[PDB]
């Protein structure tokens, strides 16, 4: 899929990422 929003996905997980 060449056409897919290549931006950042602002609604991501902003938490601490324990792993």
């Amino acid at each position: 899929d060449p056409n897919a929003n290549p931006n950042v996905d602002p609604n991501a997980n902003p938490n601490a990422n324990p792993n």
Partner: antibody
Framework: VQLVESGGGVVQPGRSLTLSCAAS????????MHWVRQTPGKGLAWVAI????????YYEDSVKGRFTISRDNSKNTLYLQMNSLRVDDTAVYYC????????????????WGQGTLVTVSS | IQMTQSPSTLSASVGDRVTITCRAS??????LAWYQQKPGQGPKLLIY???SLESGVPSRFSGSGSGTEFTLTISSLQPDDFATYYC??????????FGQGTKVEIK
């Protein structure tokens, strides 16, 4: 290399117990270490994690606020202060070392201790 | 993630081929490890990232899979390979959880 724990025994519910975990044969101040339970009749379960510096800790959802994991790099030890013990916490506790990994995602627990038995009963 | 291992207990003889299947309730990419725990000891790492082999393990142990279906394969069972095997996962944003553990017994 070797990794041996201590401090087990039997205590009454509600008492406080301190576990230790001495590491030898390698640079202990280089690895983030874990504590893992083993309740008979159930598989292993994770308990805490120490971030190679004492800066970051993450606990299991059932032991948050009753368990305190802390490490001393100078004497090559780990400590897991267990407060407000309950009958559920009867399990063998293991130390685990996180394998060196060439990424930002950690790795598995390679070096495991022989385990100490902690019994809580009346 | 809840990791369930099947079969719970499998019987095998020396030199027989053994396959253990581990499944995950959510996708864990390739982040998965296997452990061997002989009775009365501490478990020893065998496979990390579900494909690589930890240094010091014999070449008999192997593993493959990605996503939610993982398997461990022992090409030739040995008298020292009779122990309980565990399936651990470490996803990107999920904590470490272990499986029930399958015991390989002597036929």
């Amino acid at each position: 290399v070797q990794l041996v724990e201590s401090g087990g025994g039997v205590v009454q519910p509600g008492r406080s117990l301190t576990l230790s975990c001495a590491a030898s044969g390698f640079t202990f101040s280089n690895y983030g270490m874990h504590w893992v339970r083993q309740t008979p009749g159930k598989g292993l379960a994770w308990v805490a994690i120490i971030w190679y510096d004492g800066s970051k800790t993450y606990y299991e959802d059932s032991v948050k606020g009753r368990f305190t994991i802390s490490r001393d790099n100078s004497k090559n030890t780990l400590y897991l202060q267990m407060n407000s013990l309950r009958v559920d916490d009867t399990a063998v506790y293991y130390c685990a070392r996180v394998r060196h990994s060439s990424s930002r995602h950690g790795s598995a627990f390679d070096l495991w201790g022989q385990g100490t038995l902690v019994t809580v009963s009346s | 993630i809840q990791m369930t291992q099947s079969p719970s207990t499998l019987s095998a003889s020396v030199g027989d081929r053994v396959t253990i299947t581990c499944r995950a309730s959510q996708s864990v990419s390739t982040w998965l490890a296997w452990y061997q725990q002989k009775p009365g000891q501490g478990p020893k790492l065998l496979i990390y990232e579900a494909s690589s082999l930890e240094s010091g393990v014999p070449s008999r142990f192997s593993g493959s899979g990605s996503g939610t279906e993982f398997t461990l394969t022992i090409s030739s069972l040995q008298p020292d390979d009779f122990a309980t095997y565990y399936c651990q996962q470490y996803n990107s944003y999920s904590f470490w959880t272990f499986g029930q553990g399958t015991k390989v017994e002597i036929k």
